[PDB]
Amino acid sequence: MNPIIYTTLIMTVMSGTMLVMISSHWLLIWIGFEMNLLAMIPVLMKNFNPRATEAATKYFLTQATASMMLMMAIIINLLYSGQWTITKMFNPVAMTMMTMALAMKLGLSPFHFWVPEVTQGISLQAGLLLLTWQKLAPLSVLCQISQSINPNLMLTMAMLSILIGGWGGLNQTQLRKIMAYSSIAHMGWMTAVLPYNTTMTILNLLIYITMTLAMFMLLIHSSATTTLSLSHTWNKMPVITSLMMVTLLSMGGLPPLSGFMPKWMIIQEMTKNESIIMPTLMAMTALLNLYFYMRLAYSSSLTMFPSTNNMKMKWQFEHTKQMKLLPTMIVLSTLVLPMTPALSSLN
Amino acid sequence: AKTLLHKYSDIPEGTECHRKAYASTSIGGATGLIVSAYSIALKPPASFLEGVARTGRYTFTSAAIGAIFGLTSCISAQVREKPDDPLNYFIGGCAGGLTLGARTRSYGIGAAACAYMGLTAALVKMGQLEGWQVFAEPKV
Amino acid sequence: YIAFILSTIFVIGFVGFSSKPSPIYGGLGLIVSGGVGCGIVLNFGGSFLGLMVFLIYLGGMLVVFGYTTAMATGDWVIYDTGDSGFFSEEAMGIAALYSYGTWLVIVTGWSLLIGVVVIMEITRGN
Amino acid sequence: LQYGPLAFVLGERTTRKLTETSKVITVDGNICSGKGRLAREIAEKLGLRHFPEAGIHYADSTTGDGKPLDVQLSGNCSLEKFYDDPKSNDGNSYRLQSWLYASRLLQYADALEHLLSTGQGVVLERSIYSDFVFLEAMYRQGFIRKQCVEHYNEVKKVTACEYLPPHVVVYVDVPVPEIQSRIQKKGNPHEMKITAAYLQDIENAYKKTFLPEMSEKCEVLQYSAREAEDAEKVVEDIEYLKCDKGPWPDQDDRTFHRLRMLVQNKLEVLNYTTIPVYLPEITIGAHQSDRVFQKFTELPGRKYSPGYNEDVGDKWIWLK
Amino acid sequence: TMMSGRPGRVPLQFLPNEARSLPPPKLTDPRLVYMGFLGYCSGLIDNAIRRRPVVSAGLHRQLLYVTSFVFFGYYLLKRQDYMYALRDHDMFAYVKSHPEDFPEKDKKTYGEILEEFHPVR
Amino acid sequence: ARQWQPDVEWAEQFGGAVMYPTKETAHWKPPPWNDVDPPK
Amino acid sequence: SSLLDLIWLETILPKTTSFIQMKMSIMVSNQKGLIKLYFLSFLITIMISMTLFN
Amino acid sequence: MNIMLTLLTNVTLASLLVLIAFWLPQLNAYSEKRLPFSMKFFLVAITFLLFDLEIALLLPLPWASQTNNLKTMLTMALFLLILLAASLAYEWTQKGLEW
Amino acid sequence: PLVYMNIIMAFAIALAGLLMYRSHLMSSLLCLEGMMLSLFIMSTLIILNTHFTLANMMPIILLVFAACEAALGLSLLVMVSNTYGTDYVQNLNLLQC
Amino acid sequence: PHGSPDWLKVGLTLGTSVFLWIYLIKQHKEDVLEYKRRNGLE
């Protein structure tokens, strides 16, 4: 599309998210979600092909259903109390409806099915936006109403998300589906700590966003969308593959990397509330994410796969466009564990 | 809901074998029905009749597992004269695993099922005794 | 129980079109349901909002739906007691949109302009 | 300021650059035909920019210094070995074919970039579109396998679906016996080994498959050896015809912006030429890959970006 | 803890006025040095990705990297110290105002405490 | 006397639509390289 | 060496874990991509959450 | 109830007249012997829908003029009309109103 | 009371019909529109019963936004048809989990 | 390609670094003085 129109649409997406984040009226939050959904569809469909169109319609149907149930929950809450302010939910049925709507907006299990297909259908830039920016508004709304969530439903959906992400990532050779399942598992980790501490949720979201931005930018730099295509990168730019390997090790929660900070903290917080079994199962299940990260690292940088002759021509050329903040994203996603006590800034 | 859980738990551990068996059978049947609904939704095999056959098979398997577990655990607790002991649940769990292995007609699942189920039932009994919480309330 | 009778019909029409037979017939069922719902709102006392249903919903959105398809193949107790004066409160609250709801007008107008742009960009094709 | 979204937003519109003479032109013919002289004369008369036919070391002439690199660092193939032993054990024939297609793709991208950046037209020899005739002949003579032509078809699909075909196709027709006499006169000992069958299949592919498909979306001027001697009538024919059937009149400023962002950034042009399809003729083992890549790095001016090589005489590296 | 609803809190203030009563972090703070090290690593990685001599490609760029990291780290350290000070202040005030929830334990001596002994055999 | 490195046979196990192929999945095909489906 | 170390100790911990995780991965990821079944499942989970957690 | 009776009478008379029209000539004995999907028409329908939404927004103007906040109301009404004109201009300039 | 229950029941029926997905994505869009109409009726009744004057704008707003969404959905549907010749739901199986 | 050291960008980067350093040092001094004044140290 025209660059002016693209910039306007991106600004509209961000403005819808910010309208959700700054408003105290339920109708304005709904309007922010509507504006975000309206501006999001062209961004997914920017490169026109049947796959992108299919992904856009799937995303539209899912988000429209979620927004309809969100409006229903708002109306029920207003019926049982003449309130429009986003606070305590005042009704269990309305709160269950709101939780389910926000879960489908986020892609938590069992509403996870659309995330892998939408991510596979769209390009890498649209996938970056969808997996990083499109999580802020529902998580902020969940943080604002955390004191009213039924912990049983929230914890059930979080544990299901962790399990589903871990199991679904094992079967994937497409990198975008791997990212989608990783996102589902990280969303489960984020939402398993909402009932106890929203600061932990925000810290996990920040760390995950940094890591996802770094990995998506590394995938864009080495324009690969499959495992075998990524296995050719060492013969053109081995530095990119080494950086990606360290980032993948960080994403697996291995200390002393940055990705260890959230789980650690979350586990600690859960233990402070006499919750022992669930964090144990959560770490056991995150082992699966680590396994398929390690498989990608094996195929990418720790071994050398066969190349092709036409790669020689590619040796004579350099990337014309360089993404700023990529080095900062890599450093922030690998080496911020010693600065862990900074979380008291209520990030 | 928790109604079935209340019906099962309100019975004392070493008494009313028939009531405990019936409650465990009901819980197993409910679990099998839920699994059948999910399987039918995600995988429509060929037709309505095959779907109802699959639903009935899953429900009967789950109900039989629950019934065997409940009967065996209650009988073990009664005859051993040592209630509040996880070995009775372990024995019940192993029996349930064996019942499932016999239903599927394969020794590896039965052997594997018996060991894992026995462990899970003993763990649940230990959690009841010690007060372990799976879904903890936000204390702090 | 006139309101109750309308409500029962409303649900029956919803069951009719929710079975999703022959989308033209589902559209006819949704048209009947929308008419009954507008009747409910009118019988309640919301004349402007019921007429807004009847005009906007039925005559624009369901008309566009049918056009696109054609291209292809207990009561009376909870009520008030006093009167509203020499105006209608619903009209006053709706007209307060330009004096109280400046923020609402701004965000809605921006959304509608963005919607026009988005529709054009999506239907461009290429 | 390099071209990008910001340049497009502020001032850069390529539609005002077109001046009815852009008219990308491609000239095709059999081996050792007179098409090169005709294309050079067309470029000289019309004021366009001539592109000599892309060879094995075309990419070397555009990067670093224009001097070609070693054969094992650039191309890993030779035409003389194909002429001597076309039925090679090492599958050099298809390696040469794939490398030549990639070179033609790079040259087409360069020509499109020049045309869209300046408005001046360009003249080309055998482009990517006409590249297939050699592959067809090489298949009918038994030099390559069917898997090779399938791989070529996949690559050609994913690459050529993103560019505008040439406005005018100029074909020179020469008889096979006359062209064999011309090879005899050339004196190149390796060229004297081409059988008449190879030339006949080249001509058959050209006539049966390439000419009619280009006649459906472009303007075609079929010329003989005699009437290609005078370029005046050729230029008169070029000016007389008008392009109204091709996709070029359909293009607008937005599509031009997209295609101009594509023609620069050569790594995106070359992206799908190395798809992970493992055919023994082109797949290279890890050890040889590592050795050859390390060897390439050793060459002066290749270790660091173009402006960051002290060995080459670059200065103020710390401040750049 | 959840100090979001703490009374007298300005909605979007990075550092309140009352934060100025606390000692500022020293410029040789080890955490500040680690932030500068992070900036230096970012500069080196920027050199490596762009295919430039890693150690000595852009000195101005590396200096800007380090300086920006140090600047943001200083302000972040100030905010973190202030937040921990608030936590401790509230804890002590609450303990003072609820003496019946925090009784003084009657001190006992090990000579009058009977602890069970387990031999290792 | 040489370190082992993956070869074509080793590299082909990651070229399918998914890992761990089954009877149901056996007919699945990887997406196109440019992620474009012919208009047909 | 053979029966215990190479077979049964291998069978118990690592091989069983691999088999179970791979079977669960095949179960979870083998979905045809039809919104029919996905939204039917959504309806089922909505009913379960309505009638089980309250 | 008066409007209900009026609508009932109108519908009853229409049905009776149409039925007698369709059944009077059916008593005597006689012989008794695609793809295109134009985009432009869809675009016209969608433009109608969006402009109708903006009309729905503009409708309360006859009541909006008695508020004592005349400057704010005038500003917001002119804002709505200006954005409606901007939507028309955008559709016009990007070749959205051609045949 | 009973009137509120019927409106909710209509919303639940429309949501269930949307989640059934027999075929004909147009039926899905119709179910979404029925859900929104139910929401409009319910919110209007609540706002009128309690004499919340300033809330009288809220139904209109909702309607407008919903119709905009409807337009968007319709556009998507058309594009899908223009690729397959039909609005059949089973034709959207290129992307899979 | 063939490019000289861009003196504009180098100057801007160096000036930004110097300005940030001076601002940080001044801010630290003011913080120390204000803390001392508030707590009555010096």
Ligand SMILES: CCCCCCCCCCCCCCCCCC(=O)OC[C@H](COP(=O)([O-])OCC(O)COP(=O)([O-])OC[C@@H](COC(=O)CCCCCCCCCCCCCCCCC)OC(=O)CCCCCCCCCCCCCCCCC)OC(=O)CCCCCCCCCCCCCCCCC
């Ligand atoms: C508690 C921890 C304490 C230590 C902290 C550790 C981390 C600190 C540093 C973090 C990163 C910052 C620097 C790394 C940038 C990467 C650039 C690079 O590759 O190196 C090239 C460059 C030399 O090569 P070149 O000739 O310039 O150009 C070649 C091209 O760059 C490209 O050459 P090429 O393309 O021809 O070669 C390709 C090669 C190139 O591939 C690479 O080398 C990429 C580097 C790995 C990725 C970096 C990850 C990001 C940071 C995460 C760190 C993880 C730490 C957590 C612990 C887990 C350990 C893994 O890739 C491969 O061969 C593929 C095989 C992969 C092998 C296995 C991969 C393992 C990676 C894990 C590395 C972790 C430690 C790295 C230590 C530093 C490495 C330089 O290295 C350097 O010389 C710079 C290193 C640092 C400079 C120090 C100078 C300061 C001294 C001044 C005075 C002393 C200070 C004291 C003051 C008081 C005195 C008075």
Ligand SMILES: CCCCCCCCCCCCCCCCC[C@@H](O)O[C@H](CO[C@H](O)CCCCCCCCCCCCCCC)COP(=O)(O)OCC[N+](C)(C)C
């Ligand atoms: C990988 C680590 C994360 C990196 C994050 C990106 C880094 C670049 C961002 C640059 C700084 C952004 C701060 C914005 C400037 C002013 C902010 C101020 O106006 O807002 C305050 C808020 O300030 C921010 O919250 C502090 C952000 C600091 C983030 C650092 C914590 C990182 C965790 C520890 C890892 C170490 C990282 C160190 C290297 C960067 C007031 O918040 P308030 O409106 O009243 O309450 C709303 C928030 N609630 C609901 C959670 C309570």
Ligand SMILES: CCCCCCCCCCCCCCCCC[C@@H](O)O[C@H](CO[C@H](O)CCCCCCCCCCCCCCC)COP(=O)(O)OCC[N+](C)(C)C
């Ligand atoms: C502060 C930061 C400014 C720059 C950042 C802008 C961020 C994005 C733009 C959106 C901000 C909207 C600003 C207006 C907020 C509305 C409230 C304010 O304007 O007061 C109103 C005053 O109305 C003003 O006249 C509104 C004028 C603003 C509209 C003109 C331009 C709007 C463009 C905003 C961006 C939308 C897209 C851009 C189109 C070009 C209320 O009037 P008043 O009567 O006292 O109070 C009503 C209550 N009563 C009845 C009890 C008395």
Ligand SMILES: Nc1ncnc2c1ncn2[C@@H]1O[C@H](COP(=O)(O)OP(=O)(O)O)[C@@H](O)[C@H]1O
């Ligand atoms: N696709 C190809 N396969 C094999 N050889 C090729 C190919 N393209 C060009 N050549 C070789 O390039 C050489 C010179 O090109 P040609 O047009 O035939 O003669 P000239 O340019 O001197 O008029 C010829 O020997 C021809 O065989």
